[PDB]
Design an enzyme around this catalytic site. Structure first.
Site, PDB file in Angstrom:
ATOM      1  N   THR A  46      46.631  36.242  43.260  1.00 13.85           N
ATOM      2  CA  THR A  46      46.375  37.290  42.282  1.00 13.85           C
ATOM      3  C   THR A  46      46.797  36.846  40.891  1.00 13.85           C
ATOM      4  O   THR A  46      47.534  35.876  40.738  1.00 13.85           O
ATOM      5  CB  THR A  46      47.118  38.588  42.638  1.00 13.85           C
ATOM      6  OG1 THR A  46      46.816  39.597  41.668  1.00 13.85           O
ATOM      7  CG2 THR A  46      48.619  38.357  42.671  1.00 13.85           C
ATOM      8  N   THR A  47      46.318  37.559  39.875  1.00 12.69           N
ATOM      9  CA  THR A  47      46.703  37.287  38.497  1.00 12.69           C
ATOM     10  C   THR A  47      46.540  38.561  37.686  1.00 12.69           C
ATOM     11  O   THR A  47      45.489  39.209  37.744  1.00 12.69           O
ATOM     12  CB  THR A  47      45.861  36.165  37.884  1.00 12.69           C
ATOM     13  OG1 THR A  47      45.891  35.017  38.741  1.00 12.69           O
ATOM     14  CG2 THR A  47      46.403  35.788  36.515  1.00 12.69           C
TER      15      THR A  47
END
Lengths: 212, 213, 245, 73, 198, 237, 235, 241
Positions: free
Chosen positions: E1-2
């Site tokens: 994720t980011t």
């Protein structure tokens, strides 16, 4: 997460006919770091008793505070200061109270009993209890207690006068054994505190030791 | 706090003759990563007490919140009594030891500086509960490479003035930034003296790299 | 007796709980505490009654600091007042610990009012026997002053007065342009009002306790300084002589 | 004060404290307090009435007795 | 994720990738990381989805009740403080790191980052998630104070594009949300609206 | 009354609460005690009663942590309970914070503890009045606490049966205090107890207790022959 | 008037009195008299045993009991409350010995029993009324022989000589007349038995009394029939 | 029968709860009155607003509360009880939204509050707090909704209701006005409510001595009308009546 750390420390106690010497090295490390140089390991519980606590410093501090609080509670409850034997028994009970999470602290109480003679009690962390005549504890106890056995108990020396040790001779014994301790035990050294308990009171005497 | 997530770094404290001066980076590291750099790891507990932590920044923040609320309550009382540096040191030691025994440690090592009754105080409450009053403190990985300089200076001259104490802390933080993988060239110096506590912003070291080329 | 006035959990055959009314009667028997909300602050004044020459100055303070930015002025049973001050201090501390910023005074007043209502609900506890005022000032909310009474109502105010001389104090406060006065003058007006409402032949001894929280304190409640209180007291005595003349 | 006007009441009496201690006495009961204080001072051969004589007066007026109850410090 | 958040005068833009892996398999490829806490406050979540979602729902409940009781819009600091309390208290059970960004009348355009643990730090720009590091260093150079809403939108888009490109656990679409006085404007960059090499 | 004074939970129809007043009356069933303070000392002096000429005289000065002592007037059960609570609070403060508990904060704790019973039907108000003498870094303090849960910071006070004589003496002579040697201070306290004593009675070493605290003097209680240097020096009527 | 003020132990009367404590103290009188005397040579306890009829063997009326090897308790009041307080005293003495490894002083044990007795309605101790029993702890400790008297209100105090029970008012006067500090233990025993014979409606002989003594030395000793007869010979 | 009167849990020999009836008397004790009416696509609550002092902050003085974003209430009775019950209603609505994921229906919130009150009416722990809550909201499937939550657990839904001193008079007036073209618009509903209050109280309203809260299908957010809007309604509708 280990909840214990060995801060190092050496304490010694010699009873006697009319005195009780309780002495301790002032060095206090946290492994291979000398860290603090002050903070000796002998506390004046009352004008007739001094307790030497060695080992994990946090437990030393907390146990000393607990002992002082319990002495105050006993004074309020009984209108009289605790005797050295009573302090020793109460401390044994306190130490055993945490039998399954022990105070990592070796204790040596030294002071005058009710009769007025010297008296030294030694405890293991779990709360053992014995009225020895002279005992060492901590890191250099291994190399200290034997010499006390030799020179106060006259062990292995046949055909010798069993003269009771005087205060001056006991002080010289303590200073010499602690010089050898500062030399051989890396933990020991860096100033030495002496607490002489006698009818007059508690006398504090400091002796310079190896700085390293 | 079994595992420390985002840790600070070494904190220094020196006993100025008329006060106490502590120094601490602004870097909050997450393993081998700077992450947050503009965070102050020094707190002004009250007019004559200051705190510096070198462990989990979340735990330091929690302790800062608790100490600030305690001081606010005391001021609310406003009965002329103020927590001494030694009183704050003892309360902090008891809290840390209590949580150690509970096996839920606060993963912080904290220098407590203060100046009350014309007396300078400097204490070393660590994670487990060890508490001290040494003349100079270097908590964290900076103990090994900072305590020597402070000790030699103090033994050659037990009493230090403002300028020399500041220079000594600057040189110690300089060596720290030189040889501390988790350091940063932006450190706060907090000074407590009779006039109060002052935190002197984001100071920086004038590193000399031609020395080793 | 009425037969319905024991326990605060019993409704008389009119919808009236008489224990709360008796608590209100208890508060309407004490010294007078007033508070005026000027444009840039709030000033509390209390006519503390020195009930003996033995008590040292500052004994039985009726002006508490309930959180740094909020002051409390009590009137009634001082034991209950101290307990309520402790409750409000704890509520403000909990707010700052949970949400992370100084408690709004409207919210603090609501919380303490709910606590007082809690104690007026049950038959195992008696309603709090005191009223009080909560004053504060901040840049983003402005000067605020609320009054709480034993029944637990938290109406806001511009000028309030609780105690023996409440009607007279309100009458003397109405004749003030508080909405455009400053703290430095509203303090003098507070001292004058307190001196006028104070009864010398009935209450004998007397001590004026003043406090303000306003812009000139950066929203920090505190006791009015010595010199300012002295000047306000002098002005109040001069105004008493002027009104007599 | 009215009913003690014509006596040797010492200046140290604290009529405010007496009024505090009365707690729902009539004016007749206050007069009786003064009278009983006078009688108690006449006992023990006293030249002046005293505040403690007044306290004993309130006690006698209520018909109660004062005893050193053993469970009081 | 980011997840990323950038502050601009008068507002703030949040951005997040749309990947949710359960190992090496994308369980959800259009996951909506951005979550509206109250109306203007948004939280970008990272770490274990269950913990992050439970924390976000609890904080939404708490902040909604708080705002209704106060009759005032909530503070971004208040929302981030609720997140900090929960995360710090349950350090050992919550594998969640969050970024709380939003706007309030008093201190409009705020970005706090509560990473793993219980920290509480305001930042001009905050970054979190597994793929953070790369774009983290990149934004250290790219960021410049004084950006406007459009520049911040492009900045966030490029940053998240880099993170998605270089991170196996991040990838999909890029969801942006610009918050300010006017309100919240949310958009998505699917396949071509997102940079190709930068 | 008769239905408004059965418990502390009922307000009378006058804004008045009756069981608290009854406890404040119980405070007067004790014995006279006068506390007072100079600028560097605090002295409690108590008239110890006697249950019989064989039984010793009941103690009235108790020793809270080294910088605090207490003089009690009222129910001895409540005196014991409050003394234990004060000792525990002082010990807890000296354990957490390595410094003595401020007297003005100890008295606040006592006030809260004693106020709690005065509002809930589970117990009776503590029928004991206290004179708390202490020495914190601010200075010597004398405090009075009454069963109503109200405490007053007094420069000199008296409580117990036959208290107004001592209170009037203190009001008359308090201008002398502050600039007094410890001996003069104790003498003034003893004079106050003499005033509260019945005329035929007098202060004897048997029935006088004298607790003193102050700078460089941890709270010390003088009883029996310990009070001889004070009574002996005291002038006679 | 004492109908809304003496129905509970936590209701003050307008005078500030606990009438329930008054009533427990009154219930003390219903027990048989017991005289304790403290002397430089020890402490003596002598109690009027009140055998109602034969066939009840005497070792069931425990007016004099042993607390540790250095204290005795002479009791007057309810037997049940007596048993409770005596058990508390014994257990407290043993607890103090266990912890501090020494003998609890008479004052300290009386203080512990009084601490138990204070808790009438204190809602954290469970007893709901005062213990209607009054005790005389006569023991020997490091401060020499001592005797302490404890009453239902929990109030305790040392007593150079004391008498509790039915003939308390009429026997304390005799104790005042006859007691002086420089008295030997034999003199104290003789005087206590003389007062008991004065205040008893039955004749003093062998049974119907108990006598015990704690001296600086031998432990608490309860005189048996032989010693009782020897003293009664020439009381 | 007066013995069966001091306890909430005692049935009178004929089966009546005198303490509950006294709680209703307590409702009729604040002096104020409140009225509520629902049109086709709106609901309106109007409450008498007394501010008998120049020093009392009229902004803080109020009896209209926003229970949630789309639900409003007007409280009549003791003010402390009113605010306590308002906090309880807000808490229950927040819990409903947390647990079930959608906004609490007005009828559901009324049932929850009525159950809470019935608990106190049955057990003997508190007194039944003496306040009456009139709730208004917009239900997506039913439309505008007005409800009451009297302090005995009764919560019937209403086309138009009133509470306080003049509840009977307001009820008669609204019965008459609803027997004839109950179908009301927004302006007509505000007219009916304000006229009901004015006629029952025997007074014509200043724009300030009245407080109106409104919900509409087009804008289903509880809105408290400002002084300008209240004055506009009064002047325009009195003129064109």
């Amino acid at each position: 997460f280990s909840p214990y750390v060995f801060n190092g420390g050496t304490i010694l106690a010699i009873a006697g006919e009319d005195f009780a010497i309780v002495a301790s090295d002032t060095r206090l490390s946290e492994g291979f770091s000398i860290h603090t140089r002050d903070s000796p390991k002998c506390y004046k519980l009352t004008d007739k008793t001094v307790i030497g606590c060695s080992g994990f410093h946090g437990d030393c501090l907390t146990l000393t505070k607990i002992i002082e609080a319990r002495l105050k509670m006993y004074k309020h409850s009984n209108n009289k200061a605790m005797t050295t034997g009573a302090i020793a028994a109460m401390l044994s009970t306190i130490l055993y109270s945490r039998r399954f999470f022990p105070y990592y602290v070796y204790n040596i109480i030294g002071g005058l009993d009710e009769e007025g003679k010297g008296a030294v009690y030694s405890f293991d962390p779990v709360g053992s209890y014995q009225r020895d005549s002279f005992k060492a504890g901590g890191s250099a106890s291994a190399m200290l207690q034997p010499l006390l056995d030799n020179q106060v108990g006259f062990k292995n020396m046949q055909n010798v006068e069993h003269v009771p040790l005087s205060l001056d001779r006991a002080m010289r014994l303590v200073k010499d054994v602690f010089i050898s301790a500062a030399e051989r035990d890396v933990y020991t050294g860096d100033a030495l505190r002496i607490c002489i308990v006698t009818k007059e009171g508690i006398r504090e005497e400091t002796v310079s030791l190896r700085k390293d | 706090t079994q595992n420390p997530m985002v840790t600070g770094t070494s904190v220094l404290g020196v006993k100025f003759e008329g006060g106490v001066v502590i120094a601490a980076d602004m870097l909050g590291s997450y393993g081998s990563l700077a992450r947050f750099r503009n965070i102050s790891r020094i707190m002004r507990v009250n007019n004559s007490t200051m705190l510096g932590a070198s462990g989990d920044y979340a735990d330091f923040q929690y302790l800062k919140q608790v100490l600030g609320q305690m001081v606010i309550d005391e001021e609310l009382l406003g009965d002329g009594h103020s927590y001494s540096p030694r009183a704050i040191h003892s309360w902090l030691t008891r809290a840390m030891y209590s949580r150690r025994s509970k096996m839920n440690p606060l993963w912080n090592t904290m220098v407590i500086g203060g100046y009350a009754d014309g007396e300078s105080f400097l204490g070393y409450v660590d994670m487990l509960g060890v508490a001290y009053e040494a003349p100079s403190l270097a908590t964290g990985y900076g103990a090994y490479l900072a305590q020597p300089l402070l000790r030699e200076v103090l033994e050659k001259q037990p009493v230090l003035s403002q300028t020399e104490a500041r220079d000594l802390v600057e040189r110690c933080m300089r060596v720290l930034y030189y040889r501390d993988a988790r350091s940063y060239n932006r450190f706060q110096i907090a000074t407590v003296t009779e006039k109060g506590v002052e935190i002197e912003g984001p100071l920086s070291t004038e590193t000399n790299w031609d020395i080793a080329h | 007796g009425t037969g319905y006035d024991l326990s605060a959990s019993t409704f008389s055959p009119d919808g009236r709980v008489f224990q709360v009314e008796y608590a209100m009667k208890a508060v309407e028997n004490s010294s007078t505490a007033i508070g005026i909300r000027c444009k840039d602050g709030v000033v509390f004044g209390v006519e503390k009654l020195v009930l003996s020459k033995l008590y040292e100055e500052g004994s039985n303070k009726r002006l508490f600091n309930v959180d740094r930015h909020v002051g409390m002025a009590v009137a009634g049973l001082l034991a209950d007042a101290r307990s309520l001050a402790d409750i409000a201090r704890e509520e403000a501390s909990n707010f700052r610990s949970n949400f992370g910023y100084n408690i709004p005074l409207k919210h603090l007043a609501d919380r303490v009012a709910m606590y007082v209502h809690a104690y007026t609900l049950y038959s195992a506890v008696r309603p709090f026997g005191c009223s009080f005022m909560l004053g504060s000032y901040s840049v983003n909310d402005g000067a605020q002053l609320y009054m709480i009474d034993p029944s637990g109502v938290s109406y806001g105010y511009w000028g309030c007065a609780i105690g023996k001389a409440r009607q007279a104090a309100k009458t003397e406060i109405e004749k003030l342009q508080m909405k455009e006065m400053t703290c430095r003058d509203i303090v003098k007006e507070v001292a004058k009002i307190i001196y006028i409402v104070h009864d010398e032949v009935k209450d004998k001894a007397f001590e004026l306790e003043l406090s303000w929280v306003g812009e000139l304190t950066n929203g920090r409640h505190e006791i009015v300084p010595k010199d300012i209180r002295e000047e306000a007291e002098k002005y109040a005595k001069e105004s008493l002589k002027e009104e007599d003349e | 004060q009215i009913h003690s006007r014509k006596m040797n009441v010492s200046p140290d009496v604290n009529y405010e404290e007496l009024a505090r201690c009365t707690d729902d006495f009539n004016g007749a009961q206050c007069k009786a307090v003064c009278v009983e204080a006078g009688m108690i001072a006449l006992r023990r051969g006293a030249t002046e009435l005293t505040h403690e004589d007044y306290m004993e007066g309130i006690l006698e007026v209520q018909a109660k007795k004062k005893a050193n109850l053993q469970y009081y410090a | 994720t980011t997840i990323m958040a950038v502050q601009f005068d008068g507002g703030v833009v949040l951005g997040a990738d749309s990947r949710t892996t359960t190992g090496s398999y994308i369980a959800n490829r259009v996951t909506d990381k951005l979550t509206p806490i109250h109306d203007r406050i948004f939280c970008c979540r990272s770490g274990s989805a269950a913990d992050t979602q439970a924390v976000a729902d609890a904080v939404t409940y708490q902040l909604g009740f708080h705002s209704i009781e106060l009759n005032e819009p909530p503070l971004v600091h208040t929302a981030a403080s609720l997140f900090k309390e929960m995360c710090y208290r349950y350090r050992e059970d919550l594998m969640a790191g969050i970024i709380i960004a939003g706007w309030d009348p008093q201190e409009g355009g705020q970005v706090y980052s509560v990473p793993m643990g219980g920290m509480m730090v305001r930042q001009s720009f905050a970054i979190g998630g597994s793929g953070s590091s790369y774009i983290y260093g990149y934004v250290d150079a790219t960021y410049r104070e004084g950006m406007t809403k459009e520049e911040c939108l492009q900045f966030t888009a490029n940053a998240l594009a880099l993170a998605m490109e270089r991170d196996g656990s991040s990838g999909g679409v890029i969801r942006l949300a610009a918050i300010a006085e006017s309100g919240v404007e949310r958009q998505v960059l699917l396949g071509d609206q997102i940079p190709k090499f930068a | 009354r008769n239905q408004y004074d059965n418990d502390v939970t009922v307000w009378s129809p006058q804004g008045r609460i009756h069981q608290i007043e009854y406890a404040m009356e119980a405070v007067k069933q004790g014995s006279a005690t006068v506390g007072l303070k100079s600028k560097t000392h605090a002295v409690l002096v108590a008239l110890k009663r006697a249950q019989s000429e064989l039984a010793a005289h009941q103690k009235k000065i108790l020793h809270v942590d080294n910088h605090i002592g207490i003089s009690i007037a009222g129910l001895t059960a409540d005196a014991r309970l409050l003394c234990n609570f004060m000792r525990q609070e002082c010990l807890d403060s000296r354990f957490v914070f390595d410094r003595p508990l401020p007297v003005s904060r100890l008295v606040s704790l006592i006030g809260s503890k004693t106020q709690i019973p005065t509002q809930r039907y589970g117990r009776r108000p503590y029928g004991v009045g206290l004179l708390i003498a202490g020495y914190d870094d601010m200075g010597p303090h004398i405090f009075q606490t009454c069963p109503s849960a109200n405490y007053f910071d007094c420069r000199a006070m008296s409580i117990g049966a036959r208290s107004q004589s001592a209170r009037t003496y203190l009001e008359r002579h308090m201008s002398e205090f502050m600039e007094c040697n410890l001996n003069e201070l104790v003498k003034h306290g003893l004079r106050a107890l003499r005033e509260t004593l019945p005329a035929e009675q007098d202060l004897t070493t048997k029935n006088v207790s004298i607790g003193i605290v102050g700078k460089d003097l941890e709270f010390t209680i003088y009883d029996d022959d310990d009070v001889s240097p004070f009574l002996e020096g005291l002038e006679e009527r | 008037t004492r109908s809304e003020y003496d129905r509970g132990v936590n209701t003050f009367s307008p005078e500030g009195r606990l009438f329930q404590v008054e009533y427990a103290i009154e219930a003390i009188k219903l027990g048989s008299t017991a005289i304790g005397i403290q002397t430089s040579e020890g402490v003596c306890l002598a109690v009027e045993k009140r055998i109602t009829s034969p066939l009840m063997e005497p070792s069931s009326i425990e007016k004099i009991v042993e607390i540790d090897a250095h204290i005795g308790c002479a009791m007057s009041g309810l037997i049940a409350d007596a048993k409770t307080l005596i058990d508390k005293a014994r257990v407290e003495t043993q607890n103090h010995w266990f912890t501090y490894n020494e003998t609890m002083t008479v004052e300290s044990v009386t203080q512990a029993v009084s601490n138990l007795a204070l808790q009438f309605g204190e809602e954290d101790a469970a007893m709901s009324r005062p213990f209607g029993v009054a005790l005389l702890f006569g023991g020997v400790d490091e401060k020499g022989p001592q005797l302490f008297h404890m009453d239902p209100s929990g109030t305790f105090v040392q007593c150079d000589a004391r008498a509790i029970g039915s003939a308390s008012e009429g026997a304390q006067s005799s104790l005042q007349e006859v007691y002086h500090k420089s008295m030997t233990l034999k003199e104290a025993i003789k005087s206590s038995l003389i007062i008991l014979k004065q205040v008893m409606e039955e004749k003093l002989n062998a049974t119907n009394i108990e006598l015990a003594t704690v001296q600086p030395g031998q432990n608490f000793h309860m005189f048996t029939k032989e010693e009782l007869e020897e003293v009664i010979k020439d009381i | 029968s007066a013995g069966f009167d001091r306890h909430i849990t005692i049935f009178s020999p004929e089966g009546r709860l005198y303490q509950v009836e006294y709680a209703f008397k307590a409702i009729n004790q604040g002096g104020l009155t409140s009225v509520a009416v629902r049109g086709k696509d709106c609901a309106v609550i109007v409450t008498q607003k007394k501010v008998p002092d120049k020093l009392l902050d009229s902004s803080t003085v109020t009896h209209l509360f926003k229970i949630t974003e789309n639900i409003g209430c007007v409280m009549t009775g003791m003010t402390a009880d009113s605010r306590s019950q308002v906090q309880r209603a807000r808490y229950e609505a927040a819990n409903w939204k947390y647990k079930y994921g959608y906004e609490i229906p007005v009828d559901m919130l009324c049932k929850r509050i009525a159950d809470i009150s019935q608990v106190y009416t049955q057990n003997a722990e508190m007194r039944p707090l003496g306040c009456c809550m009139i709730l208004i909201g917009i239900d997506e499937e039913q439309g505008p909704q007005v409800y009451k939550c009297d302090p005995a657990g009764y919560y019937c839904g209403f086309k138009a209701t009133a509470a306080g001193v003049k509840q009977t008079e307001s009820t008669s007036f609204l019965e008459k006005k609803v027997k004839k073209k109950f179908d009301w618009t927004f302006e007509q509903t505000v007219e009916t409510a304000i006229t009901c209050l004015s006629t029952v109280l025997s007074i014509d309203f200043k724009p300030s001595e009245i407080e109106v809260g409104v919900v509409t299908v087009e804008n289903p957010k509880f809105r408290i009308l400002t002084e300008a809007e209240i004055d506009a309604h009064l002047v325009a509708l009195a003129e064109r009546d």
